[PDB]
Amino acid sequence: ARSAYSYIRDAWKNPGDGQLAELQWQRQQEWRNEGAVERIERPTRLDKARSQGYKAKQGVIVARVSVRKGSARKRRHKAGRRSKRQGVTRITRRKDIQRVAEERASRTFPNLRVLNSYSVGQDGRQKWHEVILIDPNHPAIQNDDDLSWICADDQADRVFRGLTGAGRRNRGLSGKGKGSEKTRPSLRSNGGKG
């Protein structure tokens, strides 16, 4: 039969219809009043969290984050930039809101590494994302056959280097064949034409 988890997954397919609609109207009232990064004991989406790698273990942290909405908070030109390089409100950035969210969250927790993240909704002025974090130094994770990879020296600050699942997706590394000549092995190696 179906898993109890599959009933949260099926609910989040439409986060504006029914029981979840009335839930998110309520929650966001407290979330708007909550900080930038708030550590929360239990995730909002169990299926998604577990799917991404979350366990109910010692040293597996989850934290909600809220980033401003829209495009870029881009100013104007002080020095002589042409007509083409004069867009203030019409241009956006190259890192999606989920990546900023993951970074803000990894800096709030300078010892924990980012596992993965997901969206927990949005309103007119902000976007919320919940980020799963892991403690690399906790022996509860050092001897875990499903999570001990994150304890390697080369995995240090993995979000900032774009080695996150959310990172590789923004870097244009999803496709294995066509239209991924300029993106693999890295953008920098390909001169930044990604």
């Binding site: 042409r82 007509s83 083409k84 390089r85 004069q86 867009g87 019409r90 241009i91």
Partner: protein, 92 residues
């Protein structure tokens, strides 16, 4: 100058002499499904566009002749070399 409506002349898509109707050529409505029609939608962005950053041009104190010569038996049209016509009136 004046130039008749129906006159007996040649047509390379007929190989003989039939009565050709002299009609003014009406252009055609733009659907926008061409090569350069998409360049105005893709290649265009914030501040200046070169060739897309222009306005329609002018003329000479006389425009040429853009005519269609549809015949009697087949009704085929040949694109004849256009002369600098001041005002053209088709007799009858």
């Amino acid at each position: 100058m004046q130039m008749p409506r129906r006159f007996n002349t040649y047509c390379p898509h007929c190989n003989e002499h039939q009565e050709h109707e002299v009609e003014k050529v009406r252009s055609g409505r733009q659907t926008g499904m061409k090569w350069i029609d998409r360049q105005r939608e893709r290649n265009s962005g914030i501040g200046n566009d070169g060739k897309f950053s222009k306005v329609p041009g002018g003329d000479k104190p006389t425009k040429k002749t853009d005519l269609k010569y549809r015949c009697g038996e087949c009704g085929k049209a040949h694109l004849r070399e256009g002369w600098r016509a001041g005002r053209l009136e088709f007799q009858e």
